[PDB]
Structures are given as C-alpha cells and as structure tokens.
Write a protein that binds this ligand. Structure first.
Ligand SMILES: [Ca+2]
Ligand SMILES: [Ca+2]
Ligand SMILES: [Ca+2]
Ligand SMILES: [Ca+2]
Ligand SMILES: [Ca+2]
Ligand SMILES: [Ca+2]
Ligand SMILES: [Ca+2]
Ligand SMILES: [Ca+2]
Ligand SMILES: [Ca+2]
Ligand SMILES: [Ca+2]
Ligand SMILES: [Mn+2]
Ligand SMILES: [Mn+2]
Ligand SMILES: [Mn+2]
Ligand SMILES: [Mn+2]
Ligand SMILES: [Mn+2]
Ligand SMILES: [Mn+2]
Ligand SMILES: [Mn+2]
Ligand SMILES: [Mn+2]
Ligand SMILES: [Mn+2]
Ligand SMILES: [Mn+2]
Ligand SMILES: [Mn+2]
Ligand SMILES: [Mn+2]
Lengths: 219, 219, 219, 219, 219, 219
C-alpha cells in the first residue's frame, strides 16, 4: 500500500532557473538510467522474488527511488519556473511540452519499459540492479559536471551518493547468496568449452589467460 | 574490418521442424537478452574504452556473439523450413513475416537499441555486460527446458555455456581494476548519507544492518 | 515522500491459477489504459498544476493508482504461481519472461510514456484524465468478461468501480473551474469559422445542426 | 473512397522562411497532439461505432483533420524552402532528413499509434476525442506565441479555432447520449466503494467532500 | 483538401467471421507493409518532390492507398463483428482492444513512422516506393494463402493486383528520369572504388563479374 | 563464423574534433539509413534466400556494411574525443550519453529493427535493398555538404561511392532474375484492374498513359 507525504526528503534549492539544464535533467526523470527505471525495476522484481529478505530490500530501495524521482521532478519544476518568456526556455522542449517534468529523456524520447532488466532468478535481478545503479551514478556525474548552481549540484550529489549506497546493498544481497564473484547460477551445467577464449578480433590479460582460461590464438 | 566464413561454429542438428519453438527462439535473435544485444553492446563500448586490453576483450566477445547470433538464426531457419502448411507454422508470426529469423523477439517486438546499457565509465560497461550476460543465460535456460529435440537442446546448452564463460571474462576484467566488489567508482565524492538504509516498506540482512549500514526503522 | 505498507488494500483471492488470463491482465499493469499510466499521468501533471486544490487531488488519486498497480501485480503473481510446468503456462509470454507481472501489455508491448497525455493548462490535464479513466474502465470490463474465477472477477469489479469514482472526481474538478461543459479554454480567441460544420464525408444531429452549428452540406 | 483536390483550405502565407519554427511545427504534423493523430483516432473509431450519426461525424471531422494535416505540411514545406545553406536550417533535423514535413515531432520522435486512444464503448471514444482535442488546442497556442510571422500566426489561429469547434461537436455527441456529465458508462455495476475519497497524500473541494464523496482522512 | 464518399473501391464480402484471420489482416492496416505506410510515405514525399508530374502521381497513388486502407479496415470489421462470445475471438487481441481495426500489426505492435522510407531526392523516394510496393504484395500473398474464404480471397487478390500496378507506375516514373536501371544519382562524384567487389564472405554472378566489377577474391 | 582484424577498409582522418557534426553522423551509425540497417537487413535476408549466388552476395555486402559501420563509429569517436569541456560538445547528446558512437540517430532516437524491410521473396528483398542503398547515399550526401573538414569529406565520399556500387550489385542480381524492369513477381495471378490508373488527386506521364495504362480521368 502506497502512502505519500507532500514535501521531499531533501528540499528544493536552486539559483537562477536554468531551463536548458532542466532538459538535461530529464535524463534522471524519464531517461534510461533515470529514477523511474530504478523504482520500477526493483519493484516489479519483488513480485517474483521468493526470499522475503531480498523481496523486502527491493521494496525499500524501490520506494526510496520513488522519492528520488519526486525530487528530480521538483528540480525540473523549479528550473522551468517563471521563465517561459525567456529565449533560453524557447530553445527547450518545454516550450512545446509545457513547463515541469515529463517522462522523457533529454532527447525527447518517451520512457520505455525496454529500459528495464528483470526476470527469472534473483541472481539476474541483483546483477541487473547493480548495472542500473552504475548507469544511474554515471548520468548523475555528467549532470553534476554541467550543473547551473551550487544548490542543484549538491542535491545531485546526494542523489549520486544514494546510488553508490544502493550499489552496496545489492552487492551485499548477492554476497549473502554466495553469488557475488561466482559467475555461475541457474540449473544448466556448462559443457567443456566453458574455459575457452577465442581471439576473434586481432593483447592479453586475466580474462584470456591461465589459470582462468585456455587461450585460443587462432580459430 | 569484418570477415565472414560460411561455416557456423556448430552445424545445425534438429529433429522435426518446430516453428512454434522457433518463435520462442527469436528471444535470442532479436530479443532483449539476445545475441544482437550482446554483440552490439560490447562492440559499441569498444569505441570509448581506453584500456587497450579491455577494449580488445570487448571486441573478441562481440565477434563471438555475432557468431552466436548466426547459430540462433540457423536454428530458426531450420525449424521453419518446408513446413509452411502445417497448422503449427500458421499459428506463428512466420506465416505473415516469412520463414527464417527476423529481428523481433518472441512477441513480435522489433529489436530496439533501448535494450543496450552502455556509456562513460568502463566500470559501468563491464557491470552492464555482466547483467546482460545474466539475462542471456536465464533466457537460454528457459528455452532449454522448452526445447523440442535433443539436438536443439545441446546447441542451446553450448550457447548458455559461453555466457557463463563471458561472465567470468567480464568479472576478471572488472576485478583487475579492483571494482568487482568495490561499489564506488567515478569522480564524485560521496557525502554523509552514504551508509544509511531506510525502512520505507522487519526483514533484515547484511544489506540492511551492521557493519555496513545504520538502520533507520521509521522515517 | 513515498511510504509503503506491504499488504494491498483489498486482498489476493483467486481460484485455480490461470496463466493465460494473467497475460490478458498485464493490460492493466503495463498496458496503455493500465494502472502505471494513470498513476504516472496524474502525478507528473501535479508538478505543473498551480492550483493547490487540484494539485492535491491529482496526488491523492495518483497514489491510489500506485496501490491499484500493486494489486493487479499480485493477481498476476498468483495466476502465474506454481504453474510453470503446465502447458497453459508454456503458451504464455511468462514462459520466456519469467513468472510474475512485467511492465508490458497483453501483446508483449513494453510500456511507453507515449501512453501519457499531459501538459499545459489544467483543463487539458483534467479532460485527459477523464479519457484515461474511460479507457481504464473499458479494459477492466473486458477482463471481467474473461475472468477465470469469482475472486478475480470481484477484485476487478472493485478496481473498475474506483475508476468510475475517479472519473467523477475529475469531472467535479472541472466543474469547479466552470469548464466541464464549456469547450473553450486557453488564451487564443477563435475566428469566425468556429461554428461551422463541414460535410466532408458523404446524417444530421446536434453536432452539425442549429443553434450550435452552421451546416455546410457541400464544400 | 478518398478524393483529393490540390488546393488547400487556406493558401500558405508566410514571411521569411523560418526552418527552426518549422521544426516546432512538426508537433502538429507528426506529433502526439498533431493532425495525423486526430485524423487516425477519429477514423479508426468509425469502424466500430454503431450509431450511424456519430460514425458519420467521426468521418467528417477525420477528413477535415487530414486537410489540417495538409496545411501544416504546407507551412513546413514553405518554411524550409530554398534556405538549406542558412545556419538556422543547418541546426534543424531538416539538414539531414531533407526539407519539407516528415512524420516526426519537434524532437525527431517518429509518430506512433501509441498516441491514439480508442476502443470499445463510444462513450470512451468521444471522451478520448475531447482530450485529444484539448492537447491539440494547447500545442497550437504554444506555437502561436512562438510564431515567426503574422501570416503563419493566422493560419495557426484558424487551426486552433477548429479544434474548439471539434470539441463542441464531440461534447454535443456525448451529451446526446446523456454521458457528457454522467461519469458512469458500460455494463459493469459499481459496488460499495464508489463514492469514497482517500486522503493518500488538507486541501478540499467538491471532488473531495459532500455531497458526492465521503472523506477518508487517514487510511 | 480531402474528401470522402462512403462506398469503397468495390464491395467487400466475406463468409463467416474469422477473427483470427482478422488479426493477421492487421498487417495491411497498421503493419509495416500495410496501407497506412503506403499512403503516408507517398503523400509525405509529395511535399518535397519538385517534378509536378511525379508529385501528382504520388498524390494520385496515396489517395488510392487510403481507399485500400478503408477496405482492409472494413474486412477486419466484418471478420470481428458479432462474434464476441466465440472462443476464436477470445484468442485474439480484439478481446481486450475491441472489435474492428486498430492501427497495429498482427503482433500487437503499434504502427510507427519508422516504417517509412523517404526524403531528399525523388530517385530515393521512387526506389523506396518500389520497395514498399514489393513488401505489400508479399504480405498480401501470404494472407491470400491463409484466406478463410473466397470473398475475402478475391478482395485480397484485387489489392495485391493494384500493388503490381503501382510498381509499374513507380517504374515508369523512375525510367522517365533514367534512373530505373542506372544506379548513380545525386550530386556527389564517386571515387576510384565504385567498381570494386569484395569477397568478404566465404559464388559468382553479374554482381561480381566483368564488365561491371573488379572482383577482389581475397581481401 | 565472424572474424575481425583491427584496421578499417581505409585510414580514417579528420581535422579538429567537431562533436556537433558527430551527432549528425550518428544517422549513419544508429539511424534508419545507417550502416547497421544495411548490415542487418542484408544479413537477415541471407537466412531465407534460396539462390546460393544471391545469398552469398548478400553476405558479401553485409560484411562490408559492418566494416563501414566500424568506420562511421571511428569517425564519431575521433570527433568526440578529448573535447569534453568545449561548449560545442556540451550542446550535444554526448554530454550525457558519453563520448563516441551510440546506436541512436542524430535526434537521439534509439535504433529499431522497424528500419528493416525484408522477408518472403528475394525480389522483395532485392528491391528493398536498392531502396535502402538510396537512403544511405542520400544521407551521406547531406553529411558531405555539412562536412567539417576535408579528411572527413573524403571518407564520406568513399562510403557514398560504395553505396552506388552496392546498388549496381543489387540491380545486377534483380536483372538476373528478370525482375529489375518487370513489376510482377510472386505466385498470385493479377485480375482485370492491373492496368488501371485513377486520377484521384486534382498531369500526365508514362505512369498513366498508353500503352501501359487505361487512364480514368474522373472517378
Ligand atoms: Ca584479441
Ligand atoms: Ca505480440
Ligand atoms: Ca523493510
Ligand atoms: Ca456527413
Ligand atoms: Ca531529439
Ligand atoms: Ca490530500
Ligand atoms: Ca512492440
Ligand atoms: Ca562471397
Ligand atoms: Ca524516440
Ligand atoms: Ca492526378
Ligand atoms: Mn535514485
Ligand atoms: Mn539507486
Ligand atoms: Mn552469446
Ligand atoms: Mn555472451
Ligand atoms: Mn486504477
Ligand atoms: Mn483511475
Ligand atoms: Mn486539426
Ligand atoms: Mn480537431
Ligand atoms: Mn494498397
Ligand atoms: Mn501500392
Ligand atoms: Mn555502407
Ligand atoms: Mn550499401
């Protein structure tokens, strides 16, 4: 059951409204690595996660992401607030889509559920969640490097922080299953070619050397 | 440059043609967790990966996935050959689209680059590659349990096996950077709320408690 | 700020699990007229709705829809629970996508934000919300006509009920603005052709007759 | 059958060519609230609307929208003619896509039938048509305020005017069924929780209180 | 301007309703090779084709494609009407989407303008149209071989026949420009490699023999 | 099987980085007329083309299209590397998506298999390919006229030239089947209306004159 308290976790604080940046910020509202993606991925996973311990974790983190989503939407509201007659505004998608957040990315691409990565075994879900957090932190860094003022930059820092936090949670959820560094899961046992490496593009490293792999220099 | 030799990795060996299974098999041709996704994700990453070692690894694997894509395509061609009058065939999308593989999934959804997860830091790429590898293994397991004949099963088992192989390659690469189990990456320093968990939805675990998290029961 | 209490408003109650129907039910999870659509439309609208009275209404209804979304996801979980070896299951998308809800419709189409209808003046938002409720109720009726058991049929009846409720709320939100039956809004005054009707496909009614319109039988 | 005569409704009268505005104008050619959406939504409804009167109305309007689509297309052709060397033109999608209209929106998003809202009950269709009409009017207003010359503005004003006209036609049709202000439609009888409001997020209103709703302050 | 008389190019007649065939038939309505693709592509091209003769031809053909679209819709309508309770109907997407045509294909994929090939040069446009025609005729043939009855079969045969006609029109247009059998077009001068053929996959034919090509047997 | 050597068809050389041109260049990478469309379309066709000669030709060409794709990627890479701080770069989608090519077009649209035209008959396939080639050459020309420097211009000229080459290959293949100038193909016999031309829009040409057509001046 969903409840809602109106004010956000952190609080809206920006400088002069920056509509051009607000459009870049849509990437974390309606974009692939955005907050809607995280919130919906971890939540839809929880429905088929049998272990109550991890199902709870997914739901806690998911609900937090709904609050991050709320926050980003407020930054976008403020950065497109009372500036609809400026020329900076007129060069943004907000000029035709209206002020405020919209569930699209910075390129105007509507949010798709193809952004999501979930299903089957919990190992896939957790590994997909780790990847989604990596994408999230990445986009948050690029936006911080482009942030208009300081109040924005630090709200984005807090968000970027929580994704590093979440990354740990998922990493520890896997560790409890002993599947953190163990590449194998599922029920299908591998054949004899499992430790082979094919040099199909022609460099050496631990990914193609002993004791981990039998390197095949020329197929 | 690309080069192609006509012989596949493993020759196609199927029982009687099963066009309904052929449609399910499209999940690995034009599906989200499919071979085109793997091939394109790793290859597009190689254009912005600086480490010459890791870049080469991404290309080696990507080229293999193209060859996996070929095998999946040959399986689908075989299970839809000379059967366009059976009622099984007429209940598939192959009846209107034509025999052989197409870049759709099992639900007829056209492949979309929205499936891909890539960009920026190599830590993200490798983590995205590990997640992608999981979903590929998962989908392959489901197809294995639904396989129509033993020859088809073995070909799918080998394909699944290579995803296990690829997972290890990606882990060893991520581990060689010391970032396989280290949640932090990037340039943005974390703040004060890093090691805090919020009970926004009581099940507990290492993701939730000491020594890595301070539990907040009621926010 | 989002909070979550684990158990749903109503309670899971079905008969024998029906995976084929569960797929039809995805229409209200990840479909156009589904619960995610309503929840996200009314919520993203609230960010640019200036009137606090209506902004609150949108948020109340939106949060309720998140709980409807939770409910439908539980029906789908139950109707795909412990049936993964039946042949009914094997003919569904769940066979390859895994058990449990997924943010796609009954046709396997991923949820898109193009489903959403919002922006600009509150009159558009409310009229779009009325339309979204009409679509919602429609799909709920078709599913009720196809429901497997009685416990399902009545959970769907309660959902269909609340959408008729919501329809009223929006209809009364417009009435408070005096824009319920008044076709005009915005700031652009119409020209002289506003009351014309062009017979471009060649029947009469109030939509093309006096006193409302000047009918043009032949352009 | 369809018939086309080469002369548009209003001849194109623009100032100097403005290719940047031409891109914004694509919102009414290949955009969500655009003329193709209106034309196709109303037309596809006519195939399942039983009432011979309403069905004819949908076709009359749909054919007009096709003619509106033509005018928008002519506007876009005019504002992108013989200017492919100006730097304004080179900053638009017309530089790679070619001059003239294309079935994309102002962000380059290909038109998608996901824009359409239709199906089942005629009450839904008309309500979907009213909502669609609102978004069309809204987008037209924004384009009017951003128009490059007076001749372009007047053409857009007339187009906006017809959407006001169409809204009334749809209202009169919905009213003739007694369903313009009546929230109920369909065959499924409502249950016990029909007239109940939940304060899940205190602002009050006719949507929230007596005599139509029993307020639930804390669920 | 557009105009519409109510009877199709010719009477549509079917046997009993076959809703399962109607879903397949959606390919020619909201599918890639369907009538909407043909209509829109040729029409959108007319806005930038400078040859008044070829422009008119495109318009002539597009308007006929609209009439074909109406026919396909009416066939789909007839094959889905009054058969709600039948088990065949319940196995189709019409069960949840409603009776009659919808702008999607046989798989439930919403129609997208990405189906269209157009822009820039008339030679590109005309070649695209010949290709689109070939896809339409191909799809029609597959439907014809799946025909539920004879009345339907003869309608689809006529529609197929008209695509052959259009192909001849487009070829005559291409041939009037001298570009039907001459590959070169545009304003860019080719370099020294225009006659090279690379044997990158390992067969001979006119595509890699003298006089036309310098065959590179081993790159 | 697939194989990869590391150097392209020829050396890629540019001037200074022009990230704004690199975004335009994405059309030939992840765009509709791009190299991925060409590669995948011709390759996927090879799985169902029965003519061993034409099958091999399709494979030969597709593998070359892959090499072109690598080149386009490398051009995009060079034009986006080491220029993060520059204001031009910050105006591009690379600012949020990262340096280098991504499988999207100049508008940010993710690549989709809906760009592909294929299936059924080799004649349909070959005509589709001639059309795809025409789109590629057209796009290349627009990029060439927008070239940032001479090194880039000469690479795009070569790539354009190779499309002219492919067009000749596909034409020779079509001509070997006797279907280059003959519209008819497939297994369905046309009816009595194959030579009719309808003047539905109101010009004359070989597309509607004797000997080929019976012109219907007024339907
Ligand atoms: Ca290597
Ligand atoms: Ca489907
Ligand atoms: Ca908890
Ligand atoms: Ca009429
Ligand atoms: Ca864009
Ligand atoms: Ca409230
Ligand atoms: Ca789809
Ligand atoms: Ca060869
Ligand atoms: Ca898009
Ligand atoms: Ca004409
Ligand atoms: Mn977050
Ligand atoms: Mn997170
Ligand atoms: Mn693979
Ligand atoms: Mn793999
Ligand atoms: Mn609801
Ligand atoms: Mn509702
Ligand atoms: Mn209009
Ligand atoms: Mn209208
Ligand atoms: Mn046609
Ligand atoms: Mn045609
Ligand atoms: Mn090429
Ligand atoms: Mn080519």
């Amino acid at each position: 059951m969903f409840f809602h308290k109106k004010e956000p976790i952190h609080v809206v604080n920006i400088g002069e409204a920056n509509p051009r940046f607000a459009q870049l910020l849509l990437e974390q509202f309606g974009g692939a690595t955005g907050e809607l993606s995280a919130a919906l991925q971890y939540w839809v996973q929880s429905f088929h996660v049998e272990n109550a311990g991890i199902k709870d974790m997914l739901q806690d983190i998911a609900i937090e992401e709904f609050s991050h989503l709320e926050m980003v939407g407020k930054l976008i509201e403020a950065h497109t607030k009372n500036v609809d007659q400026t020329e900076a505004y007129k060069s943004t998608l907000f000029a035709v889509r209206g002020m405020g957040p919209h569930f699209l990315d910075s390129q105007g691409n509507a949010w798709t559920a193809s952004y999501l990565n979930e299903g089957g075994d919990v190992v896939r879900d957790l590994r997909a969640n780790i990847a989604a957090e990596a994408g999230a932190r990445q986009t948050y860094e690029e936006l911080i490097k482009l942030s208009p003022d300081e109040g924005t930059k630090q709200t984005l820092v807090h968000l970027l922080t929580r994704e590093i936090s979440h990354t740990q949670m998922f990493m520890k959820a896997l560790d409890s299953l002993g599947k953190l560094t163990d590449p194998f899961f599922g029920n299908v046992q591998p054949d004899e070619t499992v430790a082979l490496y094919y040099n199909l593009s022609s460099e050496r490293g631990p990914w193609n050397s002993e004791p981990a792999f039998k390197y095949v220099a020329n197929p």
